[PDB]
Structure formats: C-alpha cells, structure tokens
Ligand binder design. Sequence first.
Ligand SMILES: *[C@@H]1O[C@H](CO)[C@@H](O[C@@H]2O[C@H](CO)[C@@H](O[C@@H]3O[C@H](CO)[C@@H](O)[C@H](O)[C@@H]3O)[C@H](O)[C@H]2NC(C)=O)[C@H](O)[C@H]1NC(C)=O
Ligand SMILES: *[C@@H]1O[C@H](CO)[C@@H](O[C@@H]2O[C@H](CO)[C@@H](O[C@@H]3O[C@H](CO)[C@@H](O)[C@H](O)[C@@H]3O)[C@H](O)[C@H]2NC(C)=O)[C@H](O)[C@H]1NC(C)=O
Ligand SMILES: *[C@@H]1O[C@H](CO)[C@@H](O)[C@H](O)[C@H]1NC(C)=O
Ligand SMILES: *[C@@H]1O[C@H](CO)[C@@H](O)[C@H](O)[C@H]1NC(C)=O
Lengths: 879, 879
Amino acid sequence: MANYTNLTQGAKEHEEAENIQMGTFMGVYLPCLQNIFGVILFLRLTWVVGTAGVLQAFAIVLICCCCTMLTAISMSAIATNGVVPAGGSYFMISRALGPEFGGAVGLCFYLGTTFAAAMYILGAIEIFLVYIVPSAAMLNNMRVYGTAFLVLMVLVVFIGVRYVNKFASLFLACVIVSILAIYAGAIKSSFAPPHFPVCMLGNRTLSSRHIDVCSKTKEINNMTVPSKLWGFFCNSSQFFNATCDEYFVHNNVTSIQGIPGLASGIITENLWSNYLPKGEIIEKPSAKSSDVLGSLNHEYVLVDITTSFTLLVGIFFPSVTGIMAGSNRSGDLKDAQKSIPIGTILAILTTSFVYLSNVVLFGACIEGVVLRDKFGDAVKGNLVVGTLSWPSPWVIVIGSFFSTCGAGLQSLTGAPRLLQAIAKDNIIPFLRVFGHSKANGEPTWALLLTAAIAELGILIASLDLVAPILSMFFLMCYLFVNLACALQTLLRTPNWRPRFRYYHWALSFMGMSICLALMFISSWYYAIVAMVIAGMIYKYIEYQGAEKEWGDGIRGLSLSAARFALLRLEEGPPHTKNWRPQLLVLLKLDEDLHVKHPRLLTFASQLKAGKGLTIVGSVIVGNFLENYGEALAAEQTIKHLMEAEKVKGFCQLVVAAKLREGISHLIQSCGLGGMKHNTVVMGWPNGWRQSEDARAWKTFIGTVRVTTAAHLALLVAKNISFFPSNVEQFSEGNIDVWWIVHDGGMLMLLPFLLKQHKVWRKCSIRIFTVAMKKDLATFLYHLRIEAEVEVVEMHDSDISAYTYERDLMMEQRSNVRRMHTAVKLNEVIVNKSHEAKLVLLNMPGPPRNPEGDENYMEFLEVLTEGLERVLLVRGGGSE
Amino acid sequence: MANYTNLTQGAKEHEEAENIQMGTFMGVYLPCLQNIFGVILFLRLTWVVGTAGVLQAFAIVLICCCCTMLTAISMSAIATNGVVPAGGSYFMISRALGPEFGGAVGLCFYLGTTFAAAMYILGAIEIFLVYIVPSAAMLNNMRVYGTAFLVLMVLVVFIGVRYVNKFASLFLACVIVSILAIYAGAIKSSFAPPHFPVCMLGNRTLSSRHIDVCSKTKEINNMTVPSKLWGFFCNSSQFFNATCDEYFVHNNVTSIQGIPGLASGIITENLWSNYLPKGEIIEKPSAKSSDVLGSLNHEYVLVDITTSFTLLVGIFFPSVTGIMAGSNRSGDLKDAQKSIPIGTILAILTTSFVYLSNVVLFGACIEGVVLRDKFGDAVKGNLVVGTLSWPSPWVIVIGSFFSTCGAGLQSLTGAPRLLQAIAKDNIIPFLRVFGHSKANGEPTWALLLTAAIAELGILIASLDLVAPILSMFFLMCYLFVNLACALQTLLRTPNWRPRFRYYHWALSFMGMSICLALMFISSWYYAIVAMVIAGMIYKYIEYQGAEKEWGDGIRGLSLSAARFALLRLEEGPPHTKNWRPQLLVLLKLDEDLHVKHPRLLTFASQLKAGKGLTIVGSVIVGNFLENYGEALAAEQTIKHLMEAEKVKGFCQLVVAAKLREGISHLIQSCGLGGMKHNTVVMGWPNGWRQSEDARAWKTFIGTVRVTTAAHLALLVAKNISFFPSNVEQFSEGNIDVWWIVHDGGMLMLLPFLLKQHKVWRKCSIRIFTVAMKKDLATFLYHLRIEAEVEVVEMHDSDISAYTYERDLMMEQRSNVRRMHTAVKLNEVIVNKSHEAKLVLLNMPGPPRNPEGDENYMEFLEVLTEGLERVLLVRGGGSE
Ligand SMILES: *[C@@H]1O[C@H](CO)[C@@H](O[C@@H]2O[C@H](CO)[C@@H](O[C@@H]3O[C@H](CO)[C@@H](O)[C@H](O)[C@@H]3O)[C@H](O)[C@H]2NC(C)=O)[C@H](O)[C@H]1NC(C)=O
Ligand SMILES: *[C@@H]1O[C@H](CO)[C@@H](O[C@@H]2O[C@H](CO)[C@@H](O[C@@H]3O[C@H](CO)[C@@H](O)[C@H](O)[C@@H]3O)[C@H](O)[C@H]2NC(C)=O)[C@H](O)[C@H]1NC(C)=O
Ligand SMILES: *[C@@H]1O[C@H](CO)[C@@H](O)[C@H](O)[C@H]1NC(C)=O
Ligand SMILES: *[C@@H]1O[C@H](CO)[C@@H](O)[C@H](O)[C@H]1NC(C)=O
C-alpha cells in the first residue's frame, strides 16, 4: 500500500524546509515501536525475570517505564510549544530549549545512540554465534566477529542507506511477528506445553549440550552401560569400579519438564529474588537433595555475573530507550503537535504493557531454573524465550537476529546524521569538521567517528557491560529533557507556551528526580562523570554563544545574563505587591563640573543601605556636539564620588541645552524597560530668594511637576549640608515623621529603611500623625520596630492646602489663609520636634496654575521654617 | 601570664563593634590547634592505621589534610579581602561571599558543630565507660550515659560559660601533655619497650579481660592445673579427660610481646591493608598455626565493624575539621589580615604533621594485632595508644577525656552563638525565633535546638556511625567555601580583592574537586541529601533577599540577577575584543502617533536575527506634563509592533520639547551603564526637497553629527519602504558591499550578519573595494566566510571629498567638485551594481561648518540617485 521509513531527519530535511503527509499510526507510532523493541526483549528479559523474581522484575520495568513516560510528557510539551521544525527531534529540542540545552542533549543522546549501535552489534553477534551456529574464548570470538560486523554495517550505511529506508518495514514486520509468536507460544503452552526437558542432578542443575539422557545409566541392547553424563561426572566411563564424585553417588538426575503450562503455577516458586554471586551452581528449591558438597564439575550451569538490583535496572533500561525516535520523522507529518504527543505516549504504553505482561508470563511458563540460564543452555542450546513459541524457537532465533541488525542499522544511520546536525548549527566550534556532507546530503566524517566510538564500545564484548553505559547516556539525555522543561516553566521563560492538555511542571520535576535516582543507583561512578561532561558542554556552548553575539567571552557572558533577566522581566506583571524606593539622585552640577551636593549621594547611600538600584543622573548645560569630553570627565568624577560614598549603582550624564529639559528627559527615560526607578531625590534650591533670575524655584517646581505627572515618588532633602556622613554616627536622637492624611506607604516605610543603617541605628522613631491607634499599630506590628504615635488635631482650614487636594482626589475617581496655616503647622512642628535629628514631612502637590509657583515655594519655606534637617516626601503613585 | 579562650564571637561581639589586642600565637594558632586535635587522634587513629595498613592510612590522612589545607587557603583569601569584621568566622564569610553563601555555609557548619558536640560526648562516654570505669548492652549504656552527660554539658554552657573560657587553656594543656606523652612513649619504645603482652592462640588472637597467664596450664603448689582459658575453651575445667575443641588441642597459646621496639622492624608486617568483614577473627600473619577450624569461641577478638576504605575516610575526617575556629576569635586581634592566614595554615601544618608522624609511629611500634583491636582489648583492657607513653597509659586516658569534654563544651558554646548570629541577621526568616538572647547576650532557644540535635546524634550511640554524618556536613561547608571563592575570582565579582600572596583560583578549584570526591566516596547517598539541603537553603536565602529589597519574589529575583550582572559588568575593560552592532533603532513618530517606518524594525530584526540587544527609541514632540497618556499608548503600540516583527528588546519614549533635542538626549542616555548601544539605525528623510521646511534635513544631519561625536556607528537605510519582510525570501541576489577608502570592518561584518538570516540566506556577497587584495582574503578566511571580490579603482579627485577627511583623521590621531565627483562615483556604482538586491555603501562625514548641510545632503542624494536599496554605513569608532 504505502512504503515508509523509521530513520531520522537530519540537516537534509531541515535545509529543505528552510529553503521553502503521514498521519499518527504510520508516522510517529511505528518508528517508535520498532525502536523501543530491541534485542533485550529476546536475549536478557528472561534472565532478568529469573534473577529478580516476578515482583522485583515488575518493579524494575515499572520504574524504567515511569522515567521514560515522564520524559515523553516533557518531550511532548516541547513538541507542542511553537511551530515544530521539520528536522528531527534534535531541532525541536533546540528551538524549544535554546542552543545550550540543545547541544547538551544532542551530544548525550548521540553517545547513547552510538553505544546502542554497539550493543545491537554485540547482540546480533551473540545470537549468530551462540544459538544460530556454534569464557574468554567466547569473548575474543565476539570481539573479532563484532569488529567484522561493524565494518560491514558501516559500509552498508555508507553505501545504500536507501535500502535501509526500504527495508525498515521488513524489520518492523520481523519484530512484531516475533512478539506475536512469543505470545502465541505462551498461550498455547497452557493446555499443550512443548517437550523441552532439562536434566537436574538433585537440586543442582545440569547442562544439556553434551548429555543426551537425564539418567545415570542408558541401556543399549539391554546393557547397563553408564550414560555419557557418567563420564562427565566420573573419571571411569565404564561403571567398572567407578570412582564417582561425592554429590553424584547420592542424588538423582531428573528430567524436569522445562516448559510447564501457564496454568501449572510455577510463579509461586520464582516470586522471590535470587541474586546469587558469580560461580554459584543454580539450584531449584523444589527437588530433593543430599548435603555432601565439593564436587565442582564442569557441567554445572553457573551464574555468569554477580547480579544485583542496581545492576539489573541498568541491564534492562536499554530496552525502553528510543522515544526520541518517535519524532525522527517529524517533517513528514500533517498535524505535528497532535500526532507526536499521542503517538509517543501510546507507543510507550504499548511497550510497557508488552514488557509487564511478558514478565508475568515468563514467571508462569518457564521453569525457575531455565530462566537463570543466561546463554540458552540446559535446553539443548535453544533460546530460552524461544522455547515459548508456537511454530519453533527458530522463528524467534531468526526474528531477533533480523530485528537486532535492523536496529543496529537504524542507530548507525541516526547517530552520524545527528552529529552532523549538531555540527552544521555551529553551536560547538570543534565539531565543524563533521559538517562535511556527501553530495546527496549524507555524513562522511561523522560516520567514521561513530564507527570509532562503536568500536570502543565493542571492545567490551558483553551486552551485560555495554548496557549500563548506554543507559547512563540515555538517562542523562532524558534528565536534561525533563529539567529544561521544569526550569523554563518555573522561571516563566519567555516564549515558553506549552500548549499541552496534561503537562504540569510537577510531572517534569518528578521525572527529573526519578531519572536522576536511576542514574545514581545504577552507577554513581558514571553518573558524576556524565553530569560533569554535560555541564561542561553546556557552559562551553553558553560561552561560545556569548562570544559570538556580544563579542567577548566573559564580558559577553555577563551581558547575556543581564539581557535575559531584563527580557524575562518585561513579560510579567509590572506591579509589585510591595513598594520599595529605587532612587534616582538628581545631582546638581556647578560651573566647575563638580557635584554641588555630595550629601545627596551620602543620604541616598544611607537610604538604600548599599543594596538595590541607585541611578545617579545629572545634566550638563550646553551642546553635546562640543561637550562629550567634558561629559566623560564628569562621568568619571561622579563614578569616583559614588564609589567613595559606597553607593552601588550607575551614572548617566545628559548634555542638554536647557537644564529643565535635561531633567525632564532624565526623569522619564532613565533605566532599561523593567529596571525603572520610582523615586526622585532632589536637593533643596538654597538661596532661591537671593537669585534675581528666579530660575532656581522655577526649575525646582518644574521638576516637581514632572515627577508628580510621571507618578513617581519624590524626596526633596532640605538643609542637606547638615546630613551626616558615613563615618560619624548619632549617639541618640529622634526621627519625627509627620504622616498627614495621605501617602502612608512612603511616610511609614522610609524611617524603617533609615533606622536599619548603622548611622541611624541608635536613634528612635516618633510618628506625630496629624490626620486609629490599632490600625496604625498593625503597620508598626509588621515593621517590628516600636514607634511611639501621637495625634495633634487642628482646624480643617489649617490643613486646607492638604484637604483640598484630598477632595480633588475624591472627585477624581485664600493664599493668606494657606500661609497663616502653614505657620500654624510650623508652630506645632517646631514646638514638638525642634531637637529632632531628621524631620520627615509630607508635601502638598504643586498648584495646578503655574502662577502660584512663587506662592507654593513660599508655602514650603514657611512649612519648613526653623527645622534643622527636613526630608520632604510625596507619594504620588499607587503603592 | 595571660588568659584567653578558644570559643567563638557571635553577634554580641559584632554589635559592639557596630556600636563603637592579641597576636598570632594566642589569637589564631592555639584556638585552631585546640580545636583540630579532637578525640579521633586518641580513639580511632590507631584503629585506622591497623585496619588500613600504613600506606593506605597515610593516603587517607594525606587526602584529608589536603582538602583541609586548600580550604584553609580559600578561607585565608576570604580573610584578607577587605576589613575583617569583629565577629566570628561567620561574619567574615558573609561579608565576603554575600548573604546566600553566608547562610548556606553557616547552617552547614552549624549542623557540623552540633554533631561534633555529639561525637565528642560519645567519645568522652566511651572513654569513661570502657577504659576508666567498666553488645547492645554497651550501646544502651552509651545512649543513657550520653543523654545524661549532654544534659549536664548543656546546663554547664548555659550557666557558667565564663569558667569554660577560663579553662580553655587547661584543656589545651591537657591536649599537648597527652601528645607529648605519646611521643615520649614512642621514643622510649626504641631501646626499652613496655611490658604489655598479649595471649595469642597460634595466629588467632585471644582476649585478656579474664585470662591471667598465656599458657594452657598454670602451676600452683606444683600442680599443673588448667588455666582459666581452659575454662573458656574447654567445658571440663578439671583436665580429667578434658573434651577440648578443635583449634585448642592443636595450636599453642603464646605470650607475644604486644609493643615491640620502634627499631624492631615490625612495620614490614603491617604495611598492607586488611579490610576484613564483620565478625572475622583477627589474624596475625606472623605466628605459626594449624589448619583445623570450627572452634568459634567468645574470647576471639573480633572485628567490630565492617571496615572499608570509603568507611575509613569518613571515620577519620572529623579529626582535621575545625579550621573555621581559627577565625572565631578575630575581634580580639591586632593585624587580622596578617594573623589569620598564617595562623590557620600553620595550625593545619602542625596537626597534619602530628597525624602523619603518629601514623608511621603506630605502624612501626605496635604489633599488627593490637592495632586492629578497636576497644583496647587483648591488652588487659587499656587504651591502644595509651600503651605508648612515658609515665603510664593513665596520663593519656585522662588527658583524652578532659580534652574531649573540653571540645564538647567548645562546640556547645560555638554552635548556638553561630545560630543566634545567623538569626539576628534575618537572612533566613523562620529562624527568627532563635534570635532571642539573654540579658548578657547568651542564646536560649538556640541552645535548646542545639541540645535537641545533639541528642538526636547521641541516639546513634557509636562514634563509627556519627563520624560520617559530621564529616559530610563539614565537607559541604568546605565545598561551598572553596566554590564561592573560585566563582567570585573567575567571574570578576565586585569587591573581590584577594590581597594574598599565594591564593590562585586553581587552588580553590582543586580543593572544591577534592572534597567533592571526599563527600561522594564517603557516602554518595548522604552526600546528595547534603547537597540538596544546602542548595535549597541557598535558593531560599536568595529569594528572601529579593523579596526584601525589591518587594516581590520572582520578579524581584530576576531584578536582582539583572542588577548584579550589570554591576559585575561595570568593573571591567570597557572595550571589547570584537565589535558587534547593538542597535538603537530610531523610529520617527508622525502626528498620528503611528510608527512611520515598520521596515526599520523588520530590517533591525533581520540584522540581529533575534539575538543581541535592540533598543527601539522614539521621541514624542510636546510637553511631558500633558502627554504621558499618549506616551504610554504609543509605547504599547511600539511594543506590539516589536513583537510583530520578531524584535526582542526594549522600548523607550521621550516626550521632548524639541525633536532634535529629544533625539540628542536619546542617543546619549539610552541603556544602563554597561548595556549601552553602539549603533544608531535611522530611516532616510524621504521628500526633503519637497517639504519646504528647512528643518527636516537639518534634524537628520543633527542626528548624524550627534552620532559621529558620540563615537557610535551609524546605519542610514534609504528607500526602506521596499526593504523585505520576514516571511518572504530572495531566490537569487548579490549583497554588494562597496567598501570606499576607509571603515572596512563594519562594511564587511554586516553582510554576514544579514546573510546569516533566513531572508538573505540565498544571496551572494560582492566586495567592491575602491581604495591589499590578499589582506581581505585572510580576514575572510579567518571568519570562515567566502564571497566574490572585484576591484574598481578611479581617479583621486573623484574620491577627494573622502580622502580629505581621511587625511584629517591621520593628522588628527570644493563643494561643486564634491558633487561632480559624487556623480562620477554614481556612474561607476550603478554601472556595476544597479541590479543588486542591497547595496551597502560607506559614508562621508558631515561638513565641519553647519552651513554646507544643504550641500552635504545633495551630495548624499546624488550619490544614491538610482539605487534600489541603499544601506549607508559610517564607522565613527575604533572597531
Ligand atoms: C540445594 O542443596 C544444598 C545441599 O543440600 C542446600 O544447601 C543447604 O541448604 C540448607 C537449607 O535448609 C542449609 O541448612 C541451613 O544450615 C544452617 C547452618 O547449618 C542452619 O543455621 C539453618 O537453620 C539451615 O538448617 C545447609 O546449611 C546448606 N548446606 C550447606 C550450606 O553446605 C541448598 O540450600 C539447596 N538449594 C536451595 C535453593 O534450597
Ligand atoms: C591464620 O591461620 C589459619 C589457619 O590455618 C589460616 O587459614 C588457612 O590459611 C591457608 C593459607 O595457606 C589457606 O590455604 C589456602 O587454600 C587455598 C584454597 O585451596 C589455596 O588456593 C591457597 O593457595 C592456600 O593454600 C587455608 O585455606 C586457610 N584455612 C581456613 C581459612 O580455614 C589463615 O590464613 C591464617 N591467617 C593469616 C593472616 O595467615
Ligand atoms: C532417589 O531415587 C530413589 C528411588 O527413586 C529414592 O529412593 C531416593 O530417596 C532418591 N533420592 C533422594 C535424595 O530423594
Ligand atoms: C606447640 O609447641 C610445641 C612445643 O613448643 C611444638 O612441638 C608444637 O609443634 C607447637 N605447635 C604448633 C602448631 O606449632
């Protein structure tokens, strides 16, 4: 009907989509099903079940499948987010997680896939040599034939990948036919089990490669000649004065049915772990037994490796890997974000069900002794899982070989394409050599490097030792795929819109934890090494991207960190639950281009206590075309002054023609979007009456109006020459805060920040509210600093200039009276707080008409007449 | 002569210095020495030597001393940088590494100190019970006696810490007297070793708590009666047909000298590991032996714990811990930055030399069987190391007890002070409860919590099991102390001036790696838990600091990240090794407040390709007091447009009185210090001749002058309405870069940034140099980008207006002819490149006199007459 492929899509298809079909079943389901079902299912699942007991084997398969299922959910969350690139899964992961995580996952998954092509070559060799056509001799035969087979497969992939594309379907056919034959044998074996017997001497297990009859004697022509096994246990071979060993004269050889019915119920026997160390004779705890020992013969089938749980999880994990292959055909899809998630999750559920079913079936169908036989012995040298099959074990012996060769081809085509895809992205420099492609878009040097690493793997010619390394690399890939999603969801990374029905970051975090535990339990030895390798590749990719875009290595790294923080800061709720003053100190520069008020900087330092944001801005009057040198010089001056007063922050000079216009630009333009200020700190215009130009107060009131309009808070410090330095202290004093009807946020917050500095540490706080005891106490209760309160009420007209404003606020959603009431306020404040070290004091808004600006300044001067040090405060905003 | 103490200085002594003597020996040396010499030296060092073999014991002691020495170097680097606060080591660590690392190290060191108070109480109890005043019965005796002793010590430190301060000198005296007695015994054991014999049955060692003579029969009144050991190996006790077991009738009991001479040469025997598992009889591979077996008796000295290498390193590590106690008496110092590093490093060298010498002395003076005896058995119940002393083992057994109870007092004074110091800092909120102090400043709740944790430790009543947890916590403390230093030195963290003669960041990195390996080798399953607890405390402290200073949790967290990156960015070389265009796109806003040139944003996105910094700036002509609504509206519009054109960056609007002045402020004030732009991208003023207002081109040339004076690059795009979009592409085309005489760097770097985008991907590049050939080829080969070259030389007059300015540059570091030559340049440029897709072109500077601005604009206009899409480029800077 239709011809399809299971391979990956490298740069060949991505460059095609960059220059400018199949559904869910044939597109993202069958490739994943063909790539999860590996050699393990046929060569090591039985041994794992036997060695672990059905309970712990079920636990193993469940833990592995849960790691891989949470990784599938994270990978589907990656697939749905944004447009899915036409390339393989690597391109999806890159465009979804940034080039850093993309390169880390790419290299770890690549080493995984290479060592998988090695494991599959070892498995095909083991099947060909042990079962198809018959210690260290076996290992060296495997080394030699595996190297020959790898050279052949490398040539196959290099010359004729089109034929791999054509016969991927035949490979999947073989896989599914083998699995269905396993199930048909398992079901048939219930009523009619096959006649595969096993010789067993007492409770010690015998081999069957050389023995023919499970009897201590055979009778040819009614002659009690002793069986061949007598020769394999007694150095007499004739029974004539047979000097037989200890355990042989006592016990009984029995031909136990090796495949009992699924209804026979052997599961009660093998429901428990064995974990016997290396070289122990395999015992069935059912048959009779003597107690003498010693006769360690050559025919006793032995445990071939010191097995443990932590070892079994590693040996079995490479049978569930392959879910990144689910999306290796993502370019040829109709609805990517719909086909990929459902396809991957359904394929993983299918394979998990197949494994969890075969575990229990093997528990109930194969004898508890033939399971622990890791090389298909004791059954006349037949595949143990093969004994469960309807036609013959040869269908499995052939299907497994063809499937393992097909998976080797798939992973020897998927590894170099992935490596050249990582190379052409210029993510990592040194891999550029591997970008070299063939004419039709096929890798040349990547294939050679893949072959070299696969050979390095094959040098360890044992599946039982190649599986842990493969599992560790794939576990690192899955751990990063889960962690990147969890991180980008928590921190609210920009362009992280996971349009998935079931993805929650708790799933990805639980997956990261599960698979990290798997890594470390399997082998912390390899786990630390893999984590460090992946971390180094990650940091190196980040450094290279920095040096590529910003131009410097470490400079650009910090630059990128700052840019990313500010960007993340933009796509958020611009309001904050608490109000904190981020100061903009408007320093006044004299004609000497020297700060006319260092006390402004000292007080800003005292207010922020060296933490937070402090932008010190200043305007130089003149033309920028002919002042840039003076601008840089004054900037160095202000930076030295800031560093001298321990102010941590930045400086900005604007050369403008009009000081008023310069300030009106500074107030509204300082800071990058997100890092805006919300308070403007000014110095009082001393000697405003003594200036015949009157431009002092005009500029001051213009700045006040601009700050009020911009909705920023305002702190005008008056008599700033008396504000203390850093080195001196106050022995004792009182900050008297006069919190009028309005702006309780600032008037209550500032003295708390100020008393928190060492200079103002030894002073007390006195709130002389003029605008109730419990409500004010709550704020003090939260600030956790005792602050004596007191109320001094006066007439409304006395507070007219305030309450008028209040009315204007309410509706929003005479001069002689204002002056003589400012003098009444003066009388109270001076009589109560003359000796205060710092008097905070609320401000009225400037008049709506610009004519009363002189009157406004006279009002302020009166309101502050006689006080040693005043901090005029105005809220202005929301808070 | 003088009285001192070795305890810590908490917040009580720091608030004194905030409100407002000893040298090196008595100030930093003796406290560190008295705190490193713990109980291990006396109770488990001999056992470790025995069960490890002198070689591996030396390796273990060397690794521990190596980690502690590298951590001492990092801590000295912390101590020298800046002023040393008057508080304990915690205040130094905090002020040097920030509150996050300060709190993490504080809590890890505090858990360390609590479990150290527990280990020292267990050790004092073990010495009292086993050696001074005599399986699970012993464990329960230790539990109950340790709980009683802990409640006593807690009461002592709560009531009467002054007497502990007084007797710290007596405790140190005890330590030194004990160590000198050990050395004097080792020396006297050269000629005349002591008479401590051990009964040994062949090569199997016997106990001696109940035996009297190491003979099978003693003779009272000429009667060869059987010895008591007969009563312990033979259930006859009469010799009248005695039925003795297997091993006893064959072998011989011998009185082997237990302490041979130092020159005896027994070291050759115990120079190898034993690592025997649990319950194994201790075997001396020197004496004769039969081969019979079976006699498992009660008098065989048995290995009391399953020793291993990874267990031994953990059991021994808590004898090198305590280096932070060196600077726990820093407030009472004369020259802190000189006294702390020298004192700490000399103390660690002294203790390391003592340990490395005692390892070899124990190897070569004590029989290889008495060393592996972990409870001083087989020597009539005396301390193993005690047997090596000049007067008697009693001096050592009393000195060790007094030293260990003194160190218990020390750690129950040092742990709660450190906890109240971490509480009063309000670094971690929930610990605020423990901030309460006594009248004289002594912790009350902190002492109770320390008592609770120490009791939890004591409930595991075994030094051998408490030591790994203690060692893991101190290892985590040292790991953070080495990693924060490595990071702050590499990343150029502000205020990180390590004024030390020998501190190089490679040392701290090596220490970090060393004792990361130590953690994991000791117990990876404990170590991951410790790392995760420390990481959670670290991130929670960072979050609380963000919420405190900025006002919000996650928003403020990204804010802190951005501010810290910018600060770190300031104190660096302001130049960059590479130049990369960081664009300021100047969008001109029409009277309708709509973006007059979206193609500006499109081309900016194509130039930066979604990465880098793009500040889109625009000026709104008008008065700010009555326009802020329009400002927010236009800002939202420009932000939506930036998102529409795939531009990632920030938007700044300035409401200015004069458009020219607004742009002159924007060009010099955009961006925070460090994140400054370097290029200004402008749109050409189309229809300047048809708009009879002379201010259009005036404003344009003013912006050009401002850019040139600011030393920023300039990119004027002309005919921008026909520039492409993001969706469309080019089939085939040539980006022709016409590098006129100067400013080649940008003119060549731009077309590669352009062609690296999907739009311009399918175009070619042509460098039409006018004013060698191989010089370009080498630059392009270094950049790994190839293009097509062509050279078109012309007459000098034609480029006169250029060359003039070039000469004015070389000297630094008419108009009608200019127009007739711009027309000649036009001839050639069109004849070669008329049908190009994008013609880059260098620019001449604006005239010096602002009168010829009409002439300059006519020059430009004719130079670009007839070209489809021109990108005028001007260097301006260094590059
Ligand atoms: C296969 O047969 C051998 C030999 O009969 C079994 O070894 C023996 O197993 C029995 C288990 O009942 C052991 O008995 C136990 O002995 C210990 C020590 O004496 C005693 O404390 C227990 O209460 C129990 O009686 C016996 O020692 C052991 N023989 C040895 C170790 O030499 C073997 O267990 C059989 N395999 C299976 C799977 O049952
Ligand atoms: C302390 O004395 C006991 C009692 O003899 C020693 O145990 C025995 O040590 C001999 C050492 O030669 C062991 O012989 C060995 O047998 C193995 C197995 O055939 C062989 O491969 C070796 O070459 C060697 O001949 C013997 O098995 C062992 N008997 C036991 C353990 O029951 C013990 O070794 C002595 N300890 C030391 C430290 O010397
Ligand atoms: C072996 O078989 C014989 C006869 O079938 C039986 O008497 C004997 O008990 C068996 N041996 C054991 C150990 O059960
Ligand atoms: C025990 O000592 C006697 C005499 O001293 C000697 O004959 C005998 O061989 C010794 N036994 C062993 C096992 O060496």
